[PDB]
Design an enzyme around this catalytic site. Structure first.
Site: not given
Ligand SMILES: [Cl-]
Ligand SMILES: [Mg+2]
Ligand code: NA
Length: 354
Positions: A149, A259
């Site tokens: 991220e 994910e």
């Protein structure tokens, strides 16, 4: 009544010619019904939390390996692949990294020479964390989330980099250092990923695309892009997901879906169904259609997609419930997987096993 998960065909077997089928886990989920489901359906695992920076080095030079080791040992015993999540993140990361020699936040420093000294100190700390972890796990890990991220969802700077403490202190250098260090200690064959969410949608998708091209042009070792795939029933579109994976494959990078969860809600997730039993069967059907389309696509892309991991096992445990409760006064239940809270299959299962 839907059958229990251990009574139906294995997802991993179903997708054996295309990609790994993985789950995120906590050490307590390696036994009981969860462990049984894991062994039956999956051939890859990742730690939901136990390998995050704060989980491994909570105080400087104090490493805590027990949870991560349990996961590694389970992967070994069960012949599963293992993704490492994650060497670098701006969450679940201990604050001691970002304190100067006086114990104060490096971000507050106004003297530029001292800021440069702080940059070096943080990059040294980062090298030490990666070396130590990688040396422990290099013979077990089959894909590393080296950074997580690091790209922004908007455009706060010209490169669309997230302005976390890592960026405030080091610019983009933490990303270079992370990849170079991981390569140095994990070996030439180790598969190094950059992981993020909203990789299907711009501007983020293009910020990430540019970042990887920039890294690659500078000889930074990067092998693949991890698509978190925290998605909804209707968004992002199949073609958005397709285009993103094709873009990265075009650069010679691997794709992994890291994910995956298909939330029943939009963003923000309200109003939510207050309990699992309040969820109408029609919503599970809509999810099943979504799952069918997603897995058809993943199969279509399987020459450039090596692994598909869900962010959990069954609907009794998902970070999406915390999200639902946060937006609905403490009450709310999501249901993002193909297995229900009692480990029975859902309509989605049948639409991805066929
Ligand atoms: Cl941030
Ligand atoms: Mg199908
Ligand atoms: Na593949």
């Amino acid at each position: 009544v839907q059958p229990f998960a251990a009574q139906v065909a294995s997802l991993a077997d179903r997708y054996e010619e295309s990609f790994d089928i993985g789950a995120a886990v906590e050490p307590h989920q390696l036994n009981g019904r969860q462990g049984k489901v894991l062994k039956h359906h999956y051939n890859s695992i990742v730690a939901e939390n136990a390998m995050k920076p704060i989980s491994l080095q909570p105080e400087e030079g104090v490493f805590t390996w027990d949870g991560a080791d349990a996961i590694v040992e389970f992967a070994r015993k069960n012949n599963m692949n293992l993704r490492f999540h994650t060497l670098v993140w701006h969450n679940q990361v201990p604050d001691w990294f970002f304190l100067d020699e006086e114990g104060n936040p490096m971000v507050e420093e106004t003297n530029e020479a001292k800021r440069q000294a702080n940059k070096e100190l943080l990059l040294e700390r980062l090298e030490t964390h990666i070396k130590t972890v990688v040396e422990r796990y290099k013979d077990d890990v089959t894909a590393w989330d080296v950074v997580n991220e690091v790209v922004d969802d908007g455009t706060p700077n010209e490169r669309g980099l997230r302005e976390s403490v890592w960026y405030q202190i080091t610019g983009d250098e933490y990303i270079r250092v992370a990849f170079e260090t991981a390569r140095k200690y994990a070996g030439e064959d180790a598969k190094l990923f950059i992981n993020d969410y909203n990789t299907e949608v711009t501007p983020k998708r293009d910020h990430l695309y540019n970042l990887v091209q920039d890294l690659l042009a500078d000889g930074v070792p990067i092998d693949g892009v991890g698509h978190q795939a925290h998605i909804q029933i209707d968004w992002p579109t199949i073609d958005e997901i397709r285009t993103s994976m094709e873009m990265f494959a075009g650069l010679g990078l691997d794709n992994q879906v890291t994910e995956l969860d298909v939330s029943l809600y939009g963003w923000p997730p309200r109003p939510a169904f207050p309990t699992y039993d309040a969820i109408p069967q029609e919503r599970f059907q809509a999810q099943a259609d979504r799952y069918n389309q997603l897995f058809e696509l993943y199969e279509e892309l399987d020459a450039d997609l090596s692994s598909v991991t869900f962010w959990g096992i069954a609907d009794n445990h998902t970070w999406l419930d915390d999200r639902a409760r946060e937006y609905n006064d403490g009450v709310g239940k999501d249901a993002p997987f193909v297995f229900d809270p009692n480990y029975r299959v859902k309509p989605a299962f049948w639409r991805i096993i066929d």
